[model samples]
Target: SFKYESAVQYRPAPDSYLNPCPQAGRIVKETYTGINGTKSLNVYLPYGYDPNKKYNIFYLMHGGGENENTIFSNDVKLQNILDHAIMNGELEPLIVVTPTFNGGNCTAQNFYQEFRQNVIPFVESKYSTYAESTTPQGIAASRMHRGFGGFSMGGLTTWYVMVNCLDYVAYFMPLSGDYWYGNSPQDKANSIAEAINRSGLSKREYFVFAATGSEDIAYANMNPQIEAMKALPHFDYTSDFSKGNFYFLVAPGATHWWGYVRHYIYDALPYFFHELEHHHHHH
Candidate 1:
């Protein structure tokens, strides 16, 4: 069974209240050829999105044991928050796609890899949306429009994607992730350093917004990783260095729950899409 709740519902704010973009979404089945066999994905798109105008894309990953809907329904009021962001000018209007990372061994089983290769093409083709490694036109556009992020295990995949597939995604936001999968501690640390190391790829431009509630038990493991990242050679890993490209946000009152993840999304959208304000500003 998937790890998250399937029936979670979102409520709209009252008429007198401040709301963001109008809430809306569609469930897309992203079928791809994988190691075991064929797999499918369910993606979500925000309200008021225009296909004609290029917009950043956020590939949201569900937590372990959860289906794509878990993140969509329970963890974050993503549709709602996205609506609010566009209304408040917090996030430039963009597309958000949540794909299923089936089973416990999501990445190791090559689920993400399949999604990157096959499912992305299928989805982009269906929605007239942009994607990496598709037709040259699609690749060129997605090169600018692409971004990846996820929660928990999916979060780990976010970091892995940034390191291994830097050519595809321009921005990254991994909430509550660990670096113990295919990457060694040192390799993971180096990925966040001033320059790209083990991946043999240039430090393609990107942002990593990793956060956890102060009391979340996961932080016990995450704190050490953050500390190691901070200790890397000659790198400025502070939040103020936003112009310099790396960031970390900590919510003192947040926890390892969906509510916390939702808040962080609210907190991080502006920085993630900061360049959207002046399209040519991103390097």
Candidate 2:
């Protein structure tokens, strides 16, 4: 069953209530050479961003049928949310990048390859991200300071990253989507387990937030995969944040729209780099 349809129309909330754009931070439209061709991105540089300071980075993906501008242009409130969060000390100042996964052809493998090869390299090279070098060890170390999240098809991409690219990210938030085709729950669990083992990382090394609206069309498809991930042996899944590596949230009456996207961003950012920083300091 192709579960891509949603009942909710895209109505973004008004931006009047948000904090004004911070003086030291800005969003810029930039282009880079990608695997397919010239690709563009919306980059968020936090206040007083310094090139010498190794900063954490988060990559956000747009949904199917949406380009990179969807987040910045249509959902303009996100910028304010991010700005307020950082300014208020609710979130650490980190660079955020929104890149296109294309409109109609955002297959899981294609997007993942582009992110791994094109997006990460470009961002790390241009900006002072956690990855000091492009070598294997450096990439792994950099992954400890990286995060990935997306809405709709972008959320599905997050699932693919969770299974295949754990060595390249420490945080993940998949909103309103999951792997719902051609695999049973157990099969998916086994794949995730295998990936974790292959990456030589403990389950505790990653934080995953799988969020969906109660009325989202993908909820039925996503539930099974959430259960499968929860059933994994080493990682305890819970709605409560304190109990496990996996956290799931269902927004009441939200139907796969930008509201839930805003909510998820607000909830996820504070938790993003804090734990990783603590782990790094302790070790």
Candidate 3:
């Protein structure tokens, strides 16, 4: 019944999830030292975000030609979804950060380093998160509590993060994007597997909840990559997180638009972090 763990058509988020809540999360602008110089990002603090409690942190990157603010300001009021998701107790109160890719396909690929070295410490040290400290050891210790996702080129950045920064982020939502470095599908698949093998973590340690519309512009580009990954031993394809670690959701007739992307976010965000409690055999 759980779509994330099952091979199923993507469903639209309920109407109750579409509207803004009475006590919505606050979007605060945060400035961090990025690759070139000082850069900015948008931080989402859930309603009643108490400093005393720790939160799960998700880093969301923007698509090509967009800035950090576009995600929460234009196309969709993402904070609304973030607010209502937490307000309804559908998800644990968490922090959502929207950071920019700056300029290109190249920019997106290179952001993983800046994200790991600068963004993670900058945000976690200041916020009360599962990270007990902002050092590499501390960040790696709490890797399960951190996530990274993106749209279009942003999604491309997500794959890069998986390829290069797997030790830092465990949950990956690469919405409407595909791996770019490989000359062929097989090579792309190998890249992801190599990362996992290099990580030294068990199969259950990482989860990728990918989404795109059947007619999405990136579908042809992305689906082939997934098909290639399926051939590899590193990933188990299933909707249930406990049963497997990687699953893709292709919404019928959905387009490559934030309006559609928000639905993916609404549907997928709850699936992360909470799986540990829902399936406790290992623990």
Candidate number with greatest lDDT: 3
Q: Which of 1 and 2 is the better model by TM-score?
A: 2
lDDT of 1 at 254: 63
lDDT of 1 by residue, 95-156 (tens): 67777767444552255565566656766765644553376456545654677777778777
Candidate 2 lDDT over residue span 1-283, tens digit each: 1111122233333354254655547888988877767778889898888998888888888887887888867464577877766776656788999888773444644687778877788878888888888666777787868989988888888888777789889888888878644468778767877878887887668878778888998788788877887778847664333335677777778877875677667765655665546333310
Better of 2 and 3 by TM-score: 3
Full candidate order by TM-score, most accurate first: 3, 2, 1
Candidate 2 — which residues are off by over 4 angstroms? 1-19, 103-109, 238-243, 278-283
TM-score of each: 0.76, 0.86, 0.93
Clashes of each: 7, 0, 4
Query: Which parts of model 1 have CA positions greater than 4 angstroms off?
Result: 1-38, 103-109, 128-133, 136-141, 182-187, 191-195, 198-204, 233-235, 240-242, 276-283
Q: List the residue pairs that clash in candidate 1.
A: 2-65, 3-65, 3-66, 20-83, 20-84, 21-83, 21-84
Residue 179's lDDT in candidate 1: 63
Could you tell me the lDDT of residue 238 within candidate 2? 49
Look at candidate 1 and tell me the lDDT of residue 208.
58
Per residue, candidate 3 scores C-alpha lDDT tens digits across 1-283 of: 2234366457666767667789888888988775546888899998898988888889998898898999898477788888877777666678999988783333888989888888888889888888999999999988898999999999999999999988888999999999997999999999898889999978889999999999889999899999998788888998678678888899889998988899888888877875553233331
* lDDT, candidates in the order shown: 0.59, 0.73, 0.85
